[PDB]
Amino acid sequence: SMKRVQPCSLDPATQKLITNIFSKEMFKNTMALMDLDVKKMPLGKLSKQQIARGFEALEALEEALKDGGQSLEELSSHFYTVIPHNFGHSQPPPINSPELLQAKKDMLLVLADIELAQALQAVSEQEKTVEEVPHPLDRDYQLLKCQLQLLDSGAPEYKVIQTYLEQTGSNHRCPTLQHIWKVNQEGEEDRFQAHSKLGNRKLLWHGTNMAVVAAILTSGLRIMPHSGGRVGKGIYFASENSKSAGYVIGMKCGAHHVGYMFLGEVALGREHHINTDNPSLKSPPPGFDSVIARGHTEPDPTQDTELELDGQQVVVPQGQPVPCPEFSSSTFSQSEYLIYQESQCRLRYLLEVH
Ligand SMILES: C[C@H](NC(=O)CCc1nc2ccccc2c(=O)[nH]1)c1ccncc1
């Protein structure tokens, strides 16, 4: 017997978000942008086991990069058998540098979040038995187990957020704000409440691939094995939208280029400032709660405002970037804010930008 499809409860902006973040085209586009062979690795055939074997192949590579073992070519060949790549049916390149090794680790981290979105969408057994089903976009929204509320022009934080975006985004081609959603991923709450005595909270940008937005909404921002960067194995944020916007992988839709950026409330506590790269960091030093790789510039601190979120004051920058003479010789043009516990960040807002 035919099941009834119930009417969609979502507003238009939210329907479009949910369509974009679960789009098979979007996922396959992302895979093509990462040089993956989507014909040999279709979305539905992606598996946790395959991804795990990929990381094992890169771990073997890493060890070889640091005795009569297998050549980098032989070990690369093994990786590429596990994770098929496409380079116009030429040979794929040997993974023979720290930079390329990490680029492959980053590709697998994105692919793991694509696989997470696919597994999330699997039809449960209850759903096969119930006689009415939600509209597909309500179903997909519900799988996130994450409350999203579209804001309008006169939500109390709307102009504050807009100002943060405009004042710290690129001067010439600033991203155009389309929508803001407030994000409440429940049961971030409990772990985040742990740090309630920790002051020094700031609302910070996290730009991302469209392909990992569903994963982030479901699971929060995470520190994954194999993740890394100029400040080590943590979660990375920026006070300058323009820094985070560089990590936005958008998608062409009609005449526009659509992307997503998060704002997270980050309990930074006592900050350790650095001015040179340290990719080997796994934690702040003792008695510190965060590491800030300090940039040549910072949003003018004299213009900081605050929002009140769950009864805590959260600093929100509102100033254009100004020079910080004390970090004029830093290896970082713009600051990178690092935490090394997933509990120190709570997702607060999601922005669609064109
Ligand atoms: C490989 C990919 N990387 C990113 O999403 C990086 C995002 C990002 N990095 C930053 C680094 C410094 C300052 C700001 C940012 C930022 O806003 N986003 C990824 C990492 C971990 N899980 C899934 C995907």
Side-chain angles (χ1 to χ4, degrees), residues 1-15 17-172 174-196 198-354:
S1 185
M2 192 160 283
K3 297 194 174 194
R4 173 171 302 169
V5 181
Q6 301 177 331
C8 192
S9 75
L10 309 174
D11 72 71
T14 305
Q15 284 189 29
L17 170 64
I18 295 299
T19 305
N20 290 342
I21 67 171
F22 284 105
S23 163
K24 286 179 198 316
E25 204 75 77
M26 181 276 293
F27 287 130
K28 296 185 303 181
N29 288 351
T30 303
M31 293 175 63
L33 288 168
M34 290 184 311
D35 309 313
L36 301 182
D37 186 327
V38 183
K39 295 198 160 170
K40 293 184 179 164
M41 198 170 24
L43 267 186
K45 180 174 193 171
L46 281 180
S47 71
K48 285 180 179 48
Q49 190 174 121
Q50 171 174 34
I51 285 155
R53 297 180 63 233
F55 279 117
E56 299 183 356
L58 298 180
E59 286 162 16
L61 279 165
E62 175 155 32
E63 289 308 292
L65 281 179
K66 296 149 187 205
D67 46 68
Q70 302 164 85
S71 63
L72 296 168
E73 309 90 83
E74 195 172 2
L75 288 167
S76 286
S77 164
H78 173 66
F79 170 78
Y80 290 127
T81 291
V82 169
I83 306 297
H85 281 53
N86 163 51
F87 285 104
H89 291 267
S90 285
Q91 323 291 310
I95 297 164
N96 59 23
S97 59
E99 287 87 6
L100 192 50
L101 170 59
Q102 188 61 52
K104 295 320 193 187
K105 282 174 185 190
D106 291 344
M107 173 280 284
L108 281 193
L109 287 167
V110 172
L111 198 61
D113 277 351
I114 295 179
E115 195 281 328
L116 181 161
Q118 299 311 295
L120 193 55
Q121 280 187 304
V123 175
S124 63
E125 285 287 310
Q126 76 256 21
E127 289 170 307
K128 313 213 89 190
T129 63
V130 180
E131 288 199 19
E132 309 187 33
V133 300
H135 189 279
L137 301 178
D138 274 312
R139 177 178 185 257
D140 287 344
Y141 174 63
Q142 285 172 20
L143 303 166
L144 299 176
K145 290 181 172 164
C146 183
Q147 175 185 334
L148 296 171
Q149 185 51 243
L150 187 65
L151 301 194
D152 59 37
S153 305
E157 59 267 75
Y158 199 101
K159 292 180 162 215
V160 166
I161 288 177
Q162 203 167 28
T163 299
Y164 194 10
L165 168 65
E166 280 165 27
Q167 291 305 315
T168 77
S170 18
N171 265 2
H172 189 61
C174 184
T176 311
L177 183 57
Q178 303 306 122
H179 305 295
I180 313 175
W181 297 263
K182 175 101 140 139
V183 175
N184 179 17
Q185 173 38 273
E186 283 230 26
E188 278 202 304
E189 181 154 27
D190 291 0
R191 72 183 192 175
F192 192 69
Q193 295 282 354
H195 305 288
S196 72
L198 220 51
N200 193 26
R201 297 156 183 276
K202 190 174 263 167
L203 199 70
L204 297 163
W205 299 100
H206 188 90
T208 214
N209 266 265
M210 186 165 312
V212 313
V213 174
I216 291 166
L217 293 172
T218 303
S219 303
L221 295 170
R222 285 145 299 147
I223 303 161
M224 300 302 298
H226 295 305
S227 65
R230 301 172 70 178
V231 204
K233 190 174 151 175
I235 309 165
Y236 289 75
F237 302 89
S239 62
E240 299 186 35
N241 180 271
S242 68
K243 175 68 187 168
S244 284
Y247 308 85
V248 177
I249 308 295
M251 291 286 150
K252 287 171 218 73
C253 295
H256 300 292
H257 210 84
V258 176
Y260 296 101
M261 300 187 69
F262 284 96
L263 288 163
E265 176 189 338
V266 180
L268 291 163
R270 186 200 285 278
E271 300 171 7
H272 175 67
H273 298 170
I274 67 180
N275 70 356
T276 317
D277 300 31
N278 190 352
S280 89
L281 284 174
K282 304 283 187 60
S283 94
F288 294 92
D289 310 304
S290 57
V291 179
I292 317 304
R294 285 296 303 276
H296 296 166
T297 62
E298 193 67 24
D300 184 353
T302 62
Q303 306 294 111
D304 285 348
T305 193
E306 313 200 316
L307 293 169
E308 194 177 275
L309 290 168
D310 295 334
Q312 303 272 16
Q313 295 288 108
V314 179
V315 179
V316 189
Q318 306 278 264
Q320 294 212 71
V322 294
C324 296
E326 194 77 359
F327 299 94
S328 60
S329 58
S330 178
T331 63
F332 293 84
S333 301
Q334 301 170 290
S335 300
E336 308 189 10
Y337 287 71
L338 275 290
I339 53 173
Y340 301 84
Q341 306 184 81
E342 298 170 350
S343 64
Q344 279 173 266
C345 172
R346 164 130 209 214
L347 302 174
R348 282 309 188 187
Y349 304 95
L350 179 65
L351 290 64
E352 183 174 308
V353 294
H354 294 186

